[PDB]
Each structure stands twice: as C-alpha cells, then as structure tokens.
C-alpha cells in the first residue's frame, strides 16, 4: 500500500567491515575485525542493510527482518539467550511484510507494507535509558507504534525516530535533548522537564506555520526535512555547524536552513554522523559541512570546519550518500563506493587504519564483479548491499 522513493527493492548480498566486538559484523563468535568487505550469510536475498550504532539490521526480499550485534538494550528484537546467537544473523519474529527498516544506537524500527510502524529496543539520553514507548521501559520484542495514519518512511538518529506520514506530516519521538525532535521547547529538553518522559516517547507531530514534508533524514543528533516546496528544514545539534548556521548549538525550533537556500538546486539526500553532514543534490553532486577532523568532510588535507555545504569534487556522479560516526561514504551512479574520514575502525575498506581526507574507492575480493547498491555505517562498522 504505502510507497516512498526511499524504499529499496533491488535484491542483493550483504557485506560488512570494521569492528565486530559485539557481533555487528554478523560473521560469528570469533570474527572481531574485517579490514575489507566480508560476505554475510543470510537465507534470502536482501533489499536493505542498515547499520545501527553497534548492530545491523537487514531486510529480505520477502519482507523478513534479520539482525545481529549488541542486544543489551533489546535492539536485535530476538532471543539471544544462547551464547553466540547475537554474533550471526537471526530472524526477528514479526509476522508482517516489512518494506523498510531504520536503526539507531539502541533501537530498531520497521515499516510494514500497509504503513504501520513496529519498534524495539530503547532510547537513551545523557543520563541513561529513558525507555521506548513507555517511560523507563525497553522492549526486547517488536511493539507497534500507535498512529491513526499510514507512515511512508522511517529514519533514525542515535536516539530518536522520525516517521513521515502519507499526508506529509512528520512525527518524532525519542530523545530531544539536542532539539532533534523539533517539537519540544528547550525548557523541556531534559527528559520532558517537570512533565516527564511521556511527551518525548509519545509520537507527536512537528508543527510549523502547516508545512508538509516529502522526505526526512537523520544525523546522529539532528534531523533534516524537505518540505513539499523543496525547502530544507533542520533541527537538533549544531555545535560544529552540522545544520549550517542555526545561530545556536542546539536548535529546538525547526528552521528553514539558510545555508541550503537553492534556486536551481534541489537537495535530495542528507546523512550525518555526530559532528558532520554529507548531502547530495538532484544533479548527483555530493557536499559536506561540519567538523573537519580526521578528514570526515572529504575535502582533502588541511580542510577546516565548514558552515555551508561544500562541494566534494573528487567524486563521480553520486546516487546516494551516508555517514558513520566519523566517516563519510558516497555510492556512485556506476555502482562504486567511495569512503573518507577516520580510519581507526577499519571502516574505510582501504585495508589500512589511516585517515582519508579525500574520498577513496573501496576495493576488495567481495567487490569484484559486483556493483554497490547502498552503504550504511555505524560507530565502528559499515554495511554494504551489493549485486553481481
């Protein structure tokens, strides 16, 4: 029933690389690190592969969800009582046909073909677990988010979830400490203030004098939304200019970002790590802004902090972009994938742990005779969806 351009339908194979201390690589109890893309065995073809902070969620062609990684807060949405079960792909018991998934640091969301949203795990703030849908309570199994309207897209930051409805309304829930929910006053940022967590955990609409949206994206602690008119709105953390020049380190009130006022430009994609943002326009050009350390902007060596989207010139036409905590990626129209940023966790796929201040094409045995369909990255690992 529901549909959105963000939905993925091309069947592929899942590859992972980086650190796997808690099972996020999905390669078994003793594979703690992969310097180059490694094939993950899944019983079916996969259409979407998302990296949470320390876990991975894959969606099969048939609409079944598989997960692996840290399940301490219930993020995997399945029983991992047996030692090692979290280190390999396992099915999420959900008798629904899922069309899209999203993953945060301790939560996972799944969108059903008819527009219902299921969620599991928990949200955390700067003082610990705040709960999932009910105060101070996580859920080890999928629970439905109560909404009286169909949702067409789900997107997750580290500890917040955004849901775009069929009507263009944007609902948000989770941690709003940095303003990433775009509907809570700074006065209630800390666990809802005197009124409590209820306000943060109950899905509520982002109301702007009302503006409707056609797409939305999440960085670690901030959110971008494109209105029906094509205007770019943002809210959340901007201490390193990840939202441009909001005029504040924490943007609680959604703002029409001046740093993104086009004319002939049409922004089509946004991604973000903790302190940087990577976006792309309708012409296949990629741009970055925010903190420059360790080369996460991909603008070359000597790069400095940027407050406006800056063109990443060393890249061919791009079809999609993605960010890890301190790394950036771009998938080209021709099916190649480039990476840049901090190399410490081996997320670059260069084989080395040196930082890359400029985009570098990922190469490896598992990438030969295959095209990259998508890339998603977490705190210490990265996940690729490829096809022959």
């Amino acid at each position: 029933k529901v549909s959105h351009r963000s939905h993925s339908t091309e069947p592929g194979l899942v590859l992972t690389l980086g650190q796997g201390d808690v099972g996020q690589l999905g390669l078994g109890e003793n594979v703690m690190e992969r310097k180059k893309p490694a094939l993950v065995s899944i019983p079916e073809d996969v259409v979407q592969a998302e990296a949470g902070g320390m876990h991975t969620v894959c969606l099969s062609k048939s609409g079944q969800v598989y997960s692996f990684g840290c399940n301490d807060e219930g993020a995997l949405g399945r029983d991992t009582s047996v030692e090692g079960s979290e280190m390999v792909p396992g099915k999420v018991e959900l008798q629904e046909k899922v069309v899209q998934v999203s993953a945060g640091d301790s939560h996972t969301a799944a969108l059903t073909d008819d527009g219902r949203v299921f969620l599991w795990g928990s949200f955390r703030d700067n003082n610990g677990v705040i709960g999932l849908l009910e105060p101070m309570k996580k859920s080890m199994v999928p629970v439905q988010v109560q909404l009286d309207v169909p949702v067409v897209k789900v997107a997750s930051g580290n500890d917040h979830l955004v849901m775009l409805t069929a009507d263009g309304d944007l609902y948000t829930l989770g941690c709003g400490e940095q303003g990433q929910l775009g509907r809570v006053p700074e006065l209630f940022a800390n666990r809802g203030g005197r009124q409590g967590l209820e306000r943060l955990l109950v899905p509520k609409c982002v109301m702007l004098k009302h503006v409707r949206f056609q797409d939305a994206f999440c960085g670690a602690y901030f959110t971008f939304a494109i209105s029906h008119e094509g205007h770019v709105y943002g809210f959340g953390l901007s201490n390193y200019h990840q939202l441009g020049t909001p005029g504040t380190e924490s943007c609680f009130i959604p703002q029409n970002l001046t740093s993104f006022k086009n004319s002939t430009k049409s922004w089509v994609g946004f991604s973000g790590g903790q302190h940087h943002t990577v976006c792309m326009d309708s012409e296949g050009k990629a741009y970055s802004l925010g903190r420059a350390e360790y080369g996460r902007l991909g603008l070359g060596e000597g790069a400095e902090e940027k407050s406006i989207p800056t063109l990443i010139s060393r890249l061919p036409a791009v079809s999609s972009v993605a960010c890890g905590a301190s790394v950036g990626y771009a998938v080209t129209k021709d099916g190649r994938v480039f990476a840049w940023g901090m190399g410490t966790n081996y997320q670059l796929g260069t084989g080395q742990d040196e930082d890359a201040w400029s985009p570098v094409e990922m190469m490896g045995k598992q990438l030969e005779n295959r095209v990259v369909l998508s890339v998603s990255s977490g705190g210490q690992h990265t996940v690729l969806l490829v096809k022959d």
Binding site: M32, A75, D105, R124, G128
Partner: protein, 165 residues
Amino acid sequence: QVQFKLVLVGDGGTGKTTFVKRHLKKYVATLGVEVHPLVFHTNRGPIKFNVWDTAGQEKFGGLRDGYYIQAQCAIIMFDVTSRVTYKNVPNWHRDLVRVCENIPIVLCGNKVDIKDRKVKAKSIVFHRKKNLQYYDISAKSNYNFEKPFLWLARKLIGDPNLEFV
C-alpha cells in the same frame, strides 16, 4: 604538592557521577563541567586528582579542545552491561591523543546492571585488545574503584612501587 588534571569521559548512564561521588568542594572550571578534586594518600605523599566530569559536553558542547587541553591523564568509562556505550571509545581515544599526546589512559568497564552474573562474558572482549589499560569496576563493594587511580598515579609519578594507604 602533586596535582593532576584527569578527564573523565563516557556515555550518559555509565556511572561516571556515582564513581566520583564515592571517592569524596566541586567547582566550575568551565561551561557544563564540574571538577571534583580527589586526594589520595600514598607511600609517596598525597596526590590530588582534579577530575573533570565532561558529562557529554565533549559531544554536545562548544569548548572544542578545551575539555581535554592540559589533561595529564584520563579515564574512559562505559557500561559492560549495555555495550552500546563502548561505541565512542575509539573517538575519545583519538581525541585524547591528538590534544594531549601520550598521556596515560585507563578504560573502565562499569557493571551498572548489578543483576546478571554473566558479565564475565560481556567483559572478556575488553581484557583482550591491549592498547589501553582495562579494569572491571562496579558501584557496590566499590570493586576496583581505586585501581584506575592507582595505575594512573604509578605512571604519572613513575613509581611502580607506589601504593595507596
């Protein structure tokens, strides 16, 4: 008098506040960050650690390198019972080395969920590695609560025979 600036970093809810409280006035040296002076008596004289509880400001604040500048040592803390808190350890480690260089750093695995005795499996992964000195700690019996400070003190003073009294 021997005094050291110690930076304490870690995800929220990993027990940083409780950790400091149990070793106890405090003062503000900057925005959103309280400093708690801790004095340890030893066989080499008193040693004071001025503990900066960054409280996530390194992630959300605007002092940039200001949180780490002039730090002589550090403690990176995470929750061994909620391992997603280990996510930023590499970033904290890189930043500390970039801003302070080769300062001594201790990684502390805090057992916050003191209700599940299979932490000797969730923690095994951290005793391994080796780049950083690791210690298992827990609010309750102040298990190894002094270990991190003792290790740092020995490295800072350059006396392997240093002992807390």
